[PDB]
Amino acid sequence: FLGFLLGVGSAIASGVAVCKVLHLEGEVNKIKSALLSTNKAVVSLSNGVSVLTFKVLDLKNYIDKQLLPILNKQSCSISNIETVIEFQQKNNRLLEITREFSVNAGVTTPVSTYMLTNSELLSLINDMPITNDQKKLMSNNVQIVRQQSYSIMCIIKEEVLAYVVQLPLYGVIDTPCWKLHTSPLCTTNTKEGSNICLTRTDRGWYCDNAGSVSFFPQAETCKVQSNRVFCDTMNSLTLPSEVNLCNVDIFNPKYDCKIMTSKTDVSSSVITSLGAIVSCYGKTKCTASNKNRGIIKTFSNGCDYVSNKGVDTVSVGNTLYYVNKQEGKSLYVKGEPIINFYDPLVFPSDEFDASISQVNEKINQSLAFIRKSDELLSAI
Amino acid sequence: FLGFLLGVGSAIASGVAVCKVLHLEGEVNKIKSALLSTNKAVVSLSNGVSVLTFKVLDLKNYIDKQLLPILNKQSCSISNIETVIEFQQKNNRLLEITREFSVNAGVTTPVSTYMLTNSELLSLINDMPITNDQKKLMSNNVQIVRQQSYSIMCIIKEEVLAYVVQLPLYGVIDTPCWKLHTSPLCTTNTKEGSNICLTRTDRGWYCDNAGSVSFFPQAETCKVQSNRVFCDTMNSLTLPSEVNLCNVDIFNPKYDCKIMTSKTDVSSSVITSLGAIVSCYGKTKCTASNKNRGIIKTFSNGCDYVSNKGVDTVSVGNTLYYVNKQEGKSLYVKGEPIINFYDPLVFPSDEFDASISQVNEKINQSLAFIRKSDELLSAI
Amino acid sequence: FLGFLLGVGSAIASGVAVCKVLHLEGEVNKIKSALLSTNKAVVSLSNGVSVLTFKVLDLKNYIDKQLLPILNKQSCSISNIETVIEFQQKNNRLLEITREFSVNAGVTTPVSTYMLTNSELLSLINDMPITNDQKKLMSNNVQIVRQQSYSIMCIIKEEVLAYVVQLPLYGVIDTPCWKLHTSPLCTTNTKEGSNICLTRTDRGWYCDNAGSVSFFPQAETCKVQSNRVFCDTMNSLTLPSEVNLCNVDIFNPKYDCKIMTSKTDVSSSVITSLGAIVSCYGKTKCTASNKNRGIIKTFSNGCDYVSNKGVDTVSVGNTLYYVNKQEGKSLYVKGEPIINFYDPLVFPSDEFDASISQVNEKINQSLAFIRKSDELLSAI
Amino acid sequence: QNITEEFYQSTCSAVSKGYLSALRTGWYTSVITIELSNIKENKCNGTDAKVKLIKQELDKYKNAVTELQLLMQ
Amino acid sequence: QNITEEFYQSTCSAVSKGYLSALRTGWYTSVITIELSNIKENKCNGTDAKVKLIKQELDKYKNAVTELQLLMQ
Amino acid sequence: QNITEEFYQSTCSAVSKGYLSALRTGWYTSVITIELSNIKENKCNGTDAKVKLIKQELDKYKNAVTELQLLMQ
Numbered sequence A, B, C: 001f002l003g004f005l006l007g008v009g010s011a012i013a014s015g016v017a018v019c020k021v022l023h024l025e026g027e028v029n030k031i032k033s034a035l036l037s038t039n040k041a042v043v044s045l046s047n048g049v050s051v052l053t054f055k056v057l058d059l060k061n062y063i064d065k066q067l068l069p070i071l072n073k074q075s076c077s078i079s080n081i082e083t084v085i086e087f088q089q090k091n092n093r094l095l096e097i098t099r100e101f102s103v104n105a106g107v108t109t110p111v112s113t114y115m116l117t118n119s120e121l122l123s124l125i126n127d128m129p130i131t132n133d134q135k136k137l138m139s140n141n142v143q144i145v146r147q148q149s150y151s152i153m154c155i156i157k158e159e160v161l162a163y164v165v166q167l168p169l170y171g172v173i174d175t176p177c178w179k180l181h182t183s184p185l186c187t188t189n190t191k192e193g194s195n196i197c198l199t200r201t202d203r204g205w206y207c208d209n210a211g212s213v214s215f216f217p218q219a220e221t222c223k224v225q226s227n228r229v230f231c232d233t234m235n236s237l238t239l240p241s242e243v244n245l246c247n248v249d250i251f252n253p254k255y256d257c258k259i260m261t262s263k264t265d266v267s268s269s270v271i272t273s274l275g276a277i278v279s280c281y282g283k284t285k286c287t288a289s290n291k292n293r294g295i296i297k298t299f300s301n302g303c304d305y306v307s308n309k310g311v312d313t314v315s316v317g318n319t320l321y322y323v324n325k326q327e328g329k330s331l332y333v334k335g336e337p338i339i340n341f342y343d344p345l346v347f348p349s350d351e352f353d354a355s356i357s358q359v360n361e362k363i364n365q366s367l368a369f370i371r372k373s374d375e376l377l378s379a380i
Numbered sequence D, E, F: 001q002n003i004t005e006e007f008y009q010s011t012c013s014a015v016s017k018g019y020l021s022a023l024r025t026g027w028y029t030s031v032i033t034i035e036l037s038n039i040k041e042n043k044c045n046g047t048d049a050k051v052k053l054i055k056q057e058l059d060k061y062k063n064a065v066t067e068l069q070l071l072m073q
Helices: A013-022 A027-034 A083-103 A118-127 A132-140 A142-147 A241-248 A356-377 B013-022 B027-034 B083-103 B118-127 B132-140 B142-147 B241-248 B356-377 C013-022 C027-034 C083-103 C118-127 C132-140 C142-147 C241-248 C356-377 D051-070 E051-070 F051-070
Strands: A040-044 A050-058 A150-155 A161-169 A172-182 A197-200 A204-209 A212-216 A228-232 A237-240 A258-262 A268-271 A275-280 A286-290 A294-298 A302-307 A313-316 A319-322 A329-333 A351-355 B040-044 B050-058 B150-155 B161-169 B172-182 B197-200 B204-209 B212-216 B228-232 B237-240 B258-262 B268-271 B275-280 B286-290 B294-298 B302-307 B313-316 B319-322 B329-333 B351-355 C040-044 C050-058 C150-155 C161-169 C172-182 C197-200 C204-209 C212-216 C228-232 C237-240 C258-262 C268-271 C275-280 C286-290 C294-298 C302-307 C313-316 C319-322 C329-333 C351-355 D004-008 D013-024 D026-035 E004-008 E013-024 E026-035 F004-008 F013-024 F026-035
Touching: A013 A027, A013 A150, A013 A161, A013 C319, A013 F026, A027 A040, A027 F026, A050 A083, A050 A118, A083 C142, A083 D051, A083 F051, A118 A132, A118 A142, A118 D051, A132 A142, A132 A172, A142 B083, A172 A197, A204 A228, A204 A241, A204 F013, A212 A241, A237 A241, A258 A356, A268 A313, A268 A319, A275 A286, A275 A313, A275 F004, A275 F013, A302 A329, A319 B013, A351 A356, B013 B027, B013 B150, B013 B161, B013 D026, B027 B040, B027 D026, B050 B083, B050 B118, B083 D051, B083 E051, B118 B132, B118 B142, B118 E051, B132 B142, B132 B172, B142 C083, B172 B197, B204 B228, B204 B241, B204 D013, B212 B241, B237 B241, B258 B356, B268 B313, B268 B319, B275 B286, B275 B313, B275 D004, B275 D013, B302 B329, B319 C013, B351 B356, C013 C027, C013 C150, C013 C161, C013 E026, C027 C040, C027 E026, C050 C083, C050 C118, C083 E051, C083 F051, C118 C132, C118 C142, C118 F051, C132 C142, C132 C172, C172 C197, C204 C228, C204 C241, C204 E013, C212 C241, C237 C241, C258 C356, C268 C313, C268 C319, C275 C286, C275 C313, C275 E004, C275 E013, C302 C329, C351 C356
Parallel strands: A050 F026, A228 F013, A329 F004, B050 D026, B228 D013, B329 D004, C050 E026, C228 E013, C329 E004
Antiparallel strands: A040 A050, A150 A161, A161 F026, A172 A204, A172 F013, A197 A258, A204 A212, A212 A237, A258 A351, A268 A275, A275 A302, A286 A294, A286 A313, A313 A319, B040 B050, B150 B161, B161 D026, B172 B204, B172 D013, B197 B258, B204 B212, B212 B237, B258 B351, B268 B275, B275 B302, B286 B294, B286 B313, B313 B319, C040 C050, C150 C161, C161 E026, C172 C204, C172 E013, C197 C258, C204 C212, C212 C237, C258 C351, C268 C275, C275 C302, C286 C294, C286 C313, C313 C319, D004 D013, E004 E013, F004 F013
C-alpha cells in the first residue's frame, strides 16, 4: 500500500559511471595493455577508480591462429579435426551477448551465462573484498545473484569489446526478517452501506537493519528462498525498531500505526506464509476446504484465519486460493476487532494515508464541535 | 481504478506443494519405478495425492545405447549415419529447459515448447478430468493456455530430472461477459478552477459467474480473442448481479454505484471496443478523423463518443489514438450529464474510494449544517 | 504520481486493422501476385488502404530448387557443397520467428533482428514518407526504434506467411525537454506527529509540443539517450505552456500548481539528472559521501540538495543511492520552504489530488467558519 | 460473434457486450520427468569425424546438469 | 550537449533542462511476408551424408508451420 | 529453519517470523572484455568441406560486430 512513500534512485548509476570513464582516449589502451597474458587484472583508471578487469573470451588471438596461417598464400585452403568446432562454440557466446544487448538496448537483467559463466561468476565472488559468509551466500544462490545483477554495454573501440557487470553487495546478512499480511476489517451489521472499514496499510517485508528496521512496502520486490529473504534496499524505508509494536498493540504510545479507512465492505483473502486471512462481508460464500474430503469450514461474516495444517484450499466467492504448504507453527491471537470501538456516526470514512492517532484526532475534533454546538442550541 | 480492493494469493502454491512431496526419500523411487516402459503413469504419492507423471525425454536409455557399446573397449571409436543427429536434437531440449530455469530461477511463465511440446500438451488436455467443451477451448487456444501456465523446477535427484507444470483449469466457460469503459465527467463552465469532476471507478471486465458477477478491476489481466475473454479469478472480486444496473441507472436503490470526485478537468480519451469516449475540457483540441479525408468531427467541451464506423483515428491534444476496427453495432444513449445535478458550492471535491450515496450523505450532512447554522444567525 | 489522470488507448489498433483486411478472400492473392519478382511492392488493398509489402524470406522458391530436382526420380539422393548450409540459415529465421510468436501469442515487442533485419529496417526508414531529420534519428537509434515497435501475426494462408510490423512515427523532434523531480517537504519541529507535509505531484517528463506542453507522469515510459528523450504520446497529457511557471513561482496566478498533503514525515531521496534531492526527517541518518574520502556532508532535518560534482554516493537511512555521473551544471535556488507559511492547526492533512489554490480555498473555508463561530460564542 | 456497445452520455461510460467467458478457476499439476545418465570422465584419442561432434554435445550435456544442480533445492 | 539543473529549496523540487524530444506521435504499418512451400510426405532411403541433415531441417520446418497454424486466427 | 506465524483477530493481520536477511546494500562493478579481430574481406574458392562452415560462422561474426557498432555510444 505504502510504495508511493519510497524514494527514487538510479539502478545503473554505478555501472554507467565506469562506462563513461572507459570512453576516454587512453583509458581503452590501459585495459588492453594490462591483459597482455593474464585474464584477470585490477586496472586503475585515469580518474582514480580501482576496477577488476576480466578477459573472458579471446577471439582475436584465436582468429590470428586460423586466418593468418590459413589465408596463405594463393587462396584459402581446408581445415582438419574438431578444431573448427572450437570456433562455433566461441562465436556462439558473442552472438548470444549481441542478441541480448540488441533487444535490451545495451542494458540486460538478469545476467545470463553467456554474459558471465558460472566459473567466471564464482571467480569474481572469491576475488570480491567481502566476508566468507557473504561468499557462501552468493555461491549457493547464483541464480538470485544473476537476477539482482545488471550488464551495461559501454564501448566497442577496436580490438576490444567492453561491458560492465553490476554485481550485488549483500551488506546485511542473517538478521531476523518478518512479513506482515493485512486485510480489511469491517463492521458486520446487516444494513448495506451502514458499515465502516479499517485496514493496516503497513503490510510488507520487515528486516532488522543497523539499530533500525528496513521496510519493503512492495513484497514483490523481495524473493523468498524458504528461509532467506532476498531484498533490495532501493525499494525500502528506514523505520524505527518500535514499528513491530503495532502487531502486539495497535494503540501503543511509542509508534503511530498506519491505517486506511473506507466503507467498501468487499470480500477477499490474503494468503499468508503458513495459512490464510479471510475477510468475509455481505452475501459472499467464504469457505476453507481439504481437497480429499471437501468443505471443512464455512466462514461467518467478519475477519477470520485458517492454518495450512489440514487446509489445502480457501474459497472466497468465485475465487479459489491454494494455501502455501510450507511447514511451520501458526497461532491464533484472540482479540476484539478494533473497528467495534469506533462510532460509525462520527468516523473518517475516506482516508488513504492516515494513522491510528490521526483518526482519533479527526474524531476528537468532530466529537467536540458536535457537543459544543449541541449545548449552544440547548440554551434556546 | 479498484485494483487495491483485490486480495492476495500465491500463484504457484499448488505446484510447489507437489515439489515439496517429491523431495521425500522414497518418493523419487515410486516415480522412476512406475515409468519402467510406459511414458504416462498416474503415481499416487506417500501423502495420498494423485498426480499424472510424464516421461517426456529419455536421455539415460539413449546414452546407454551410445556410451556402453561405443566406449568399448580400448578406446572410443567412430559413429555412422544420422544417428548422432538424434543426440543433438534431444540434448538441445535439455539445454533450452536449463537456460529457461537458470534465467527465471526455477519458475518459468509462459510454458515453452521445449518445457512441454504441443503433442505432450494436447495429450494432457485429453487425459485431464474435464468436460469436452473445455478440452476443445484449450486445444484451439494453446498459446493462451501456455501463457496462463507455470513450470516449477523441483528435484535433480540422480538419474531423473523432475519439474511440475501448473496448467489452468477453466471452470467457467461460455457465460456472458462485458467490458466497462469510464472517463472523467466535469462541468464545462468557463472560469478555470471553478469546475467539478465525477468518474465511475468501477471500470474493467465483468463476467456472469454462479449467480454472481466476477469483476476484474485491471482489464490488462484479461486477454481478448475477439470473442472469448481469458481471465484469471485470482485478480477478481465477487459482486452481486445488481452491479450491471449502474450502467442503465446510476441512482438505482438496489446497488450503490462507485464514483471518484475531483476538480482536475484534464482532457483524455478512452478507446472502447467499438469506438472512443472523448473527455474534452479547457483549451484542448479534441477531434475525430478519417485517414482518407482528414478531420470529420471537432469535439466541443464535455464528454462525447464516436463509433468505429468511419472513424479510424481520435486526437486529444497532442495525443493521437487509433480506434479499434472490430466489426460491431454501437448505440449512443442520450442523457443529461449527472455532474450538472450537483451544486459545486457544496460538493466533496477530494474522494478516491467513494460511492453515489456516500457523496449524497456528504452533501446532506453539509446542506443541513449550512441551513441550520444560517437560521441560528438569522435570529440575531 | 498523476498517471491515473491519463487516458487509455489501444497500442496495436493500427496493426490489427491491417491484419483484419488481409483475412479477406482475394486480399492474400493481391499481395502474392504483386511480389512476383520484386521484394518491395506498395499494394493497395480492397478497402483502399496503401501499405508497403515486403518479401523478406523466400523459402518456397528455395525449396522448389532443392526438392523437385532432388526428389527425382526413384529415391532421394545426395547433396554437394555448402549449399545445404544456405537452408540451415534460412530455416533458422523462420524457427526464431515461430518461437517468438508462440511465447508472445502472436504479438511481439521489441521487434527482433529475425522478425526484421537491420538491412530491412534501414530500407523501410528510407522508403517511409518522413523528413530527413527523422530518418537520421531512427537510423542512429535502431535499438530504441525496435523497442518502441510491435510485430503482429496476421495470416498463414497457404504459400504465404504474413505479419504486420508496427513502426514508430516521430512527429515531434528537437523540441526542448525537461524532467521535474519532486520529494516531500515537511515541517521540522520536534514533537512526533505534529508535523505537516507537502509534495508536488506534477513530477515527470515535460516536452514543448505544438504551442502546448506534453506531460509524461510516469518517467519510466520515457527513455534517455543522454541528450535525446524517447517518449510515447499515448502515456501523456496536453498541458498549457504556463505549467513551467510552477518551478519559478508555485503561487503564480496563471497556472494552478498541483500538490499532495500528508503528515507522514518519512525520509527518502530522489536521484536527479545532475545530483540528489534529500528529504531528511526524524531520527534518520542522511549523508552525502565521496567514495575515495568517505563522508563529505551530513544532512540536517528538512529538504536539501547535493550536486554530482564530487559526490558519488548519497545515503538515506539504510538505503545507499549512487548519484548519476552525467556532466552538467547545477544551481541551488535559495528560498523559504513554503510549508512554513501554512498554519498546522488549520491545514488539509489528507489530500491526494489537490492543488495550491484548492488548499488555500480549504483553509479560507476553515479560517472563516472558525473566526465567525468564535465571535458568535464571544457574545454570550 | 455479435459484439455490441452502448455509450451513456449521463455518466461518461460505455459497455461492450457480446463476449464469452474462459476464466481460470483452478489448477492442474503434473510431474514432468527427464531421465538423465551419470557418466564417467573416460576418453578416446579419436576421431576423424562424428565423435568430436558427439563429445562437444556430451560436454554441453554436463554443463546443463551442472547449472541444474547449482539451482539448489 | 548542454544539460543543466536547478534545485528549488522553497518547493523541494529540481528541474533538469537541456534535453531534446523524440516523441512517438503515430505509427507506420507494413505487411512483412515469407513465402512458404507445401511439401508432400515423400521419402528416400539415403544417405551417407548431407541429406540426413537436410531432412532434420525439413522436419523442423514442418514443426514451425504446425505451431504457426496452431496460433489460429 | 523455524518459520512461525501469528494472526491478530483485533487488527485482521498476520506476522510470519523466522526469516533471514540478504539485502542488497551496494554494488560491485567489473569491466568484462572480449578481444575482437578486424578482418579484411579476402576470399578463397574452396572448399569441399569445413572452410564453408568456417566462412558462414565468420559472416555471423561480422553481423554480430555490425549490430554492436549500431548500438552507438
